[PDB]
Nucleic acid binder design. Structure first.
Ligand SMILES: Nc1ncnc2c1ncn2[C@@H]1O[C@H](CSCC[C@H](N)C(=O)O)[C@@H](O)[C@H]1O
Ligand SMILES: [Zn+2]
Ligand SMILES: [Zn+2]
Ligand SMILES: [Zn+2]
Ligand SMILES: [Zn+2]
Length: 904
DNA sequence: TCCCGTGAGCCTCCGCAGG
DNA sequence: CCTGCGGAGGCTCACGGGA
């Protein structure tokens, strides 16, 4: 029951209601009857589509300033008075200066190791705490203590209020209190997952406290309880918590292994380890840009305009911020200082490293990275010593010649892999040949995936590249997209119909649909994924009975229902960023409480498509879920550096800042992707040009290009066609400076004959702006008599859009609109339909006088050129606009492969 | 003195019978 | 096809806290 709507950008919608045709004249404000209820024949919006498009550039991501949670379960727990406290039985085991026991009595009551006690806080605002006593002992001086493994109330979790009052979660919080702090012996049951879980589908939207999942306070993750087993030297005082905290602390501290020699109070080792990684002499190493500085002199970096000619120019009041990639080096030596008398020394391990040169590092500077491979380096004779605890990872860098295979193949077969072919010298600024002493010493079953809301097959394409899934069933209502999907996934039958329809069938028990296709049944689906269009409630205000009801019938819950009658191993819900805040973050909390209700393992976070191989600002929300018998996937780690501005990854819900398992929040392995690298090899084409297929007048001129270009023997450049802008729009565009950052605000206020012979007049500021004043030439700056609106003050067919300055004063000067993309910059959140005056409309080709084309938009996304599309020009744009950056999906799918291989 | 923000109500048509 | 109708979004305008 959803109807589309007209867009408010394109010219067709701007043009005034003439009053010469049937409909337009029949209006009520024209004396007519109005019993027709229509719009002017000259207002028929072409870019017309459903307003399902949410994430309308909001400032909810800003104001990040906020401390970390981890309440510590508060402090100062009220103390209770006890009459009698006697032990029971013989001390289970009394080693050093303690004597543990089996049970205990507190005023006649019996507490046994394993029982869940309760404690009262110090503030009557925070509910009573619970914990599972892991031990009981008698210290030689402290007295009678006990170790309480804390229990996190459901009303203290992301679920907050939507959490089942009786549900508790395991938390790595625990202290050693004094028995007298106990209040009661509350019983807590463990609602473990049914043996035959994956079959409990159909269901509708407790009697005592129970726990079933472990909760991570800072990452908002819901994983299965640790299967950690005790030993014989602690079986009486075992604490899952401490064990985890102990192992985690052991993984942090960097240690060393084998040694080689002792010299100058500094032993030379051969191997060392950190956070689980094995660093050997000869391996690669990542390092912060503050590590060292190449001896190459670190590359060191108009009059007023005719006030009257360029009026709105004053409005310009308010990847340059992009950090530097990681530093790469070869580990030549590994050692540690020593205080005369002793030989070894931890906490101070050093590393001898051979500095590597990225093209954008040599004298040739940044422009060298235009044709270079994002993983190409240069060997040099420089070296530098860095504090081991500073490395940021492990990498692989080999000689490009000793590679026992094709270089293009070597890089694609590994994660962090680099390669060099020549040596560089800073002093002589020359490119010598790498010394000889520099050369090296010389699958699982695909998941049956079901992708509803498949679209043109964006997210699906990513997994098929990561070799993790196998889309066999795709649900797409929009015929265009559906058809396209089939063109890319011939091995899967596409159900081109409504989602609510199919689930209403299989649930009612059925084998096929009208067309006659095999429907997915219980167990057939291993993985579920898709992007549910959030339409019926793109709000941000508190939920209400009216809208809430409109939610319980949305396409988000329907996706959840599919996740219910299929209980797949892995469930993924991608969507716009603001999904984590819609309706006061409620929609998010509900879809989580919904997954947790199904006893699912789930988490959530935000990713910046750019950081994964895309010259585009596209933050999106991600909801990951895993079956009770699997491992909850981690979030992809940024592969490319990106402007800190479009990386407000953090998310806050009810005064609680939540983040992700991502470490690299600044630097990264590979350099950022630019518009140049994205679309520089594309031929010059004119506005409107609708040539479906054409050739590449020029070989690849960028890494990101040699990739997407494909390896097909057919040089077919498909869909390099762009929209046909109005003759007037073509004028506005041609009058936009190629100067990086130019937009409507820099348009000439003059008259010009269009390709229609018809001439567009100038703009008249017949009013004053009490917030802008006059021009440098005392000229007026007000467009409308409201600066009430005087409909007669409206002006049409003008170079500088009448509307812009009109509303300009309250929408940040529409900075960007009708702007051109700068080569060094990056596309703004790609959309489903490019329009100069569209919210996110800085879409004017860097140099050419037109709007980005479909193929260029394909490039903005991760879509290769081999990928096919379907439908008319506008139909295509929307497919690409909705789709998910394959490079994001891939990198997001690999974090899942590490879970399938986890098995257990 | 400005800002949202939260509706209630007028305004502007899109699908759709239904002819 | 209209030809006109039911009825959904959104766009505008009258307040009510909150700095
Ligand atoms: N419930 C539903 N059933 C079938 N198709 C739907 C649908 N809801 C929306 N669609 C269609 O699917 C399109 C969005 S598809 C979004 C796909 C996502 N970006 C991805 O590839 O990961 C819309 O144009 C809409 O017409
Ligand atoms: Zn329009
Ligand atoms: Zn008309
Ligand atoms: Zn403990
Ligand atoms: Zn006005």
């Amino acid at each position: 029951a959803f109807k589309r709507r007209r867009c408010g950008v394109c010219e067709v919608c701007q043009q005034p209601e003439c009053g010469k045709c049937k409909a337009c004249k029949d209006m009520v404000k024209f004396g007519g009857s109005g019993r027709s209820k229509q719009a002017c024949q000259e207002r028929r919006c072409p870019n017309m589509a459903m307003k399902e498009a949410d994430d309308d550039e909001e400032v909810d991501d800003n104001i990040p300033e906020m401390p970390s949670p981890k309440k510590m379960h508060q402090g100062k727990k009220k103390k209770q008075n006890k009459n009698r406290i006697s032990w029971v039985g013989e001390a289970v085991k009394t080693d050093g200066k303690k004597s543990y026991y089996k049970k205990v009595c507190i005023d006649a009551e019996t507490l046994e190791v394993g029982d869940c006690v309760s404690v009262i806080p110090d503030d009557s605002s925070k509910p009573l705490y619970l914990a599972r006593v892991t031990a009981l002992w008698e210290d030689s001086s402290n007295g009678q203590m006990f170790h309480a493994h804390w229990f996190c109330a459901g009303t203290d979790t992301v679920l907050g209020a939507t959490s089942d009052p009786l549900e508790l979660f395991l938390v790595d919080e625990c202290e050693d209190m004094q028995l007298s702090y106990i209040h009661s012996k509350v019983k807590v049951i463990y609602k473990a997952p049914s043996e035959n879980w994956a079959m409990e589908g159909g269901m509708d939207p407790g009697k005592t406290y129970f726990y079933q999942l472990w909760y991570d306070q800072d990452y908002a993750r819901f994983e299965s309880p640790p299967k950690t087993q005790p030993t014989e030297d602690n079986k009486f005082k075992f604490c899952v918590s401490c064990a985890r905290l102990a192992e985690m602390r052991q993984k942090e501290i960097p240690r060393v292994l084998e040694q080689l020699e002792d010299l100058d109070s500094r032993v030379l080792y051969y191997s060392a380890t950190k956070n689980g990684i094995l660093y050997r002499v000869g391996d690669g190493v990542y390092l912060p840009p503050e590590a060292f500085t190449f001896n190459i002199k670190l590359s060191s970096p108009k009059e007023p305009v005719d006030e009257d000619l360029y009026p709105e120019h004053y409005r310009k009041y308010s990847n340059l911020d992009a950090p530097e990639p990681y530093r790469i080096g070869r580990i030549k030596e590994i050692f540690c200082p020593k205080k005369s008398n002793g030989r070894p020394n931890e906490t101070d391990i050093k590393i001898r490293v051979n500095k590597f040169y990225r093209p954008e590092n040599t004298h040739k500077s940044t422009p060298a990275s235009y044709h270079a491979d994002i993983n190409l380096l240069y060997w040099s004779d420089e070296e530098a010593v860095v504090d081991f605890k500073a490395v940021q990872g492990r990498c692989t860098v080999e000689y490009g010649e000793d590679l026992p295979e094709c270089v293009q193949v070597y890089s694609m077969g590994g994660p962090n892999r680099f390669y060099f072919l020549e040596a560089y010298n800073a002093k002589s600024k020359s490119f010598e040949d790498p010394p000889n002493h520099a050369r090296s010493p010389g699958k699982l079953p695909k998941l049956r995936t079901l992708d509803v809301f498949s679209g043109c097959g964006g997210l699906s394409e990513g997994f098929h590249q990561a070799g993790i899934s196998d889309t066999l069933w795709a649900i797409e209502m929009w015929d265009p997209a559906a058809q396209a999907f089939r063109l890319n996934n011939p091995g899967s039958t596409v159900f081109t119909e409504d989602c609510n329809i199919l689930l209403k069938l299989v649930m009612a028990g059925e084998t096929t649909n009208s067309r006659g296709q095999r429907l997915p049944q219980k167990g057939d689906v291993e993985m579920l994924c898709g992007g549910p269009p959030c339409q019926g409630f793109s709000g941000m205000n508190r939920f209400n009975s009216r809208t809430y009801s409109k939610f319980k019938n949305s396409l988000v819950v329907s996706f959840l229902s599919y996740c219910d009658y299929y209980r797949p191993r892995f469930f993924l819900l991608e969507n716009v960023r603001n999904f984590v805040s819609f309706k006061r973050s409620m929609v998010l909390k509900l879809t989580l409480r919904c997954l947790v209700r199904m006893g699912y393992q789930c988490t959530f976070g935000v990713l910046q498509a750019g950081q994964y191989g895309v010259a585009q600002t596209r933050r999106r929300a991600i909801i990951l879920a895993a079956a009770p018998g699997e491992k909850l996937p981690l979030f992809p780690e940024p592969l490319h550096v990106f402007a800190p501005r479009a990386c407000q990854l953090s998310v806050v819900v009810d005064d609680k800042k939540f983040v992700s398992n991502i470490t690299r929040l600044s630097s990264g392995p590979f350099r950022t992707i630019t518009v140049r690298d994205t679309m520089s090899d594309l031929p010059e084409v004119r506005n409107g040009a609708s040539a479906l297929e054409i050739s590449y007048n020029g070989e690849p001129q960028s890494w990101f290009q040699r990739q997407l270009r494909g390896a097909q023997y057919q040089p077919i450049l498909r869909d390099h066609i762009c929209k046909d802008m109005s003759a007037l729009v073509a004028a506005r565009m041609r009058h936009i400076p190629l100067a990086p950052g130019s937009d409507w605000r820099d348009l000439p206020n003059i008259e010009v004959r269009l390709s229609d012979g018809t001439m567009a007049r100038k703009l008249r500021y017949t009013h004053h702006d009490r917030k802008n004043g006059r021009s440098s030439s005392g000229a007026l700056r007000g467009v409308c008599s409201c600066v009430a609106c005087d409909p007669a003050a409206r002006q049409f067919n003008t170079l500088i859009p009448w509307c812009l300055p009109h509303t300009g004063n309250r929408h940040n000067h529409w900075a960007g609109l009708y702007g051109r993309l700068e080569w060094d910059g990056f596309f703004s959140t790609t959309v489903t339909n490019p329009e100069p005056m569209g919210k996110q409309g800085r879409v004017l080709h860097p140099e050419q006088h037109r709007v980005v084309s479909v193929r260029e938009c394909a490039r903005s996304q991760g879509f290769p050129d081999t990928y096919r599309l379907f439908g008319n020009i506008l139909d295509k744009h929307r497919q690409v606009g909705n789709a998910v950056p394959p490079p994001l999906a891939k990198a997001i799918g690999l974090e899942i492969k590490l879970c399938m291989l986890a098995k257990a």
